[PDB]
Amino acid sequence: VDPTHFEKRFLKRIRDLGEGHFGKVELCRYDPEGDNTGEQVAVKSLKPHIADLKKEIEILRNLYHENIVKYKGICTEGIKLIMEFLPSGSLKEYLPKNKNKINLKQQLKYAVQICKGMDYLGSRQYVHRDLAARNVLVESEHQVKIGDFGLTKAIETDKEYYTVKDDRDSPVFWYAPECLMQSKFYIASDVWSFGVTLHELLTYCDSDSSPMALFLKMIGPTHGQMTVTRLVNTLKEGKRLPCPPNCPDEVYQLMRKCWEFQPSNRTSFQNLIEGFEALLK
């Protein structure tokens, strides 16, 4: 018996966790005894892209880090990705609900854990390209995990970036200017996304101070097909998301190093881990 082979006939749908417009992530129970005692799993599948999900499956199968969601296996009819279920969900769901329990010290420990997870990915020559609070899962009050790798791409040995072709669904309010301007994705681009994610974590993912809400207030909400060129212009003039309420200036200064215009001038994940650990002493 292969423990990473899930039979379709025992994978019972409970409900949806998430949707792109090419597929979904569902809560199922793997229940081979038919009595509802089976483990709950998160199951990624396509609407009725296949090559892309097969590559994503193969990336996650071979990642093993305490701050990366666990691969559990596949269901093959078409193919489904079986992952551990984290019932606390993303930081976007968990933080608004748990402000009273989650103080600054705990936010800096989640930041360190996100940086460790990201630096392990970068070490395997991957660029994530979708690092946001909605993709960071809460394992417990004390631990988070990167929970989705839908846009993760390999960087070829002795290249520095991956160039993207399908960009129409880009999370632009999280993207470094080289991604907006030239569709180029470097590890330094994930560091820029991490700065935005840290901004979300420090605002407890409140929807009224999201990266999108705050950038739209800055550039104007009614520019349609010009939205992205105004955002790049704004970033060109030096403007950045403001210091979160209650956020100490030396945390804000580590965030700002994620957002130097030029990839080569941004902080490393290792430098961020050291900065946060210094603040935690």
Residue numbers at the binding site for a second copy (CB under 8 A)? 165-170, 172, 180-183, 220, 222-230, 232-233
Q: Is 49 annotated as a binding residue?
A: no
Measured CA to CA, the distance from residue 34 to residue 28 in angstroms comes to: 13
Give the shortest CB-47-to-ligand KH5 separation in angstroms: 8
Q: Is 200 annotated as a binding residue?
A: no
Q: Is 53 annotated as a binding residue?
A: no
Nearer to a second copy among residue 88 and residue 234 (C-beta) = 234
> What are the residues binding ligand KH5 (CB under 6 A)?
17-20, 22-25, 42, 44, 46, 53, 69, 83, 85-87, 89-90, 93, 134-135, 137, 147-148, 150
Q: From the list a second copy, ligand KH5, none, pick the one residue 19 interacts with, judged by a Cβ distance below 5 to 8 Å according to partner type.
A: ligand KH5
Nearer to a second copy among residue 168 and residue 281 (C-beta) = 168
Q: Is 21 annotated as a binding residue?
A: yes
The CA distances from residue 139 to 90, 113, 183, in Å, are 9, 11, 33
Give the shortest CB-153-to-a second copy separation in angstroms: 17
Q: Write out the E strands in 112-263.
A: 126-127, 136-140, 143-146, 153-154, 161-163, 184-186
Q: From the list a second copy, ligand KH5, none, pick the one residue 226 interacts with, judged by a Cβ distance below 5 to 8 Å according to partner type.
A: a second copy
Give the shortest CB-148-to-ligand KH5 separation in angstroms: 4
Burial 19-28 (b: 16+ CB within 10 A, else e): eeeebebbbb
Task: Count the Cβ atoms, other than its own, within 10 Å of residue 85.
Answer: 21
Q: Is 276 annotated as a binding residue?
A: no
Q: From the list ligand KH5, a second copy, none, pick the one residue 22 interacts with, judged by a Cβ distance below 5 to 8 Å according to partner type.
A: ligand KH5
- Give the residue numbers annotated as catalytic, written as ranges: 130
The CA distances from residue 145 to 68, 170, 178, in Å, are 5, 22, 27
Nearest to 240 by CA among 230, 262, 255, 225: 255
Q: Which helix (H) or strand (E) holds 94?
A: helix 91-97
Nearer to a second copy among residue 59 and residue 180 (C-beta) = 180
Give the shortest CB-21-to-ligand KH5 separation in angstroms: 7
Quote the DSSP letter at residue 34: S
From the annotation, which residues make up the binding site?
Answer: 17-25, 44
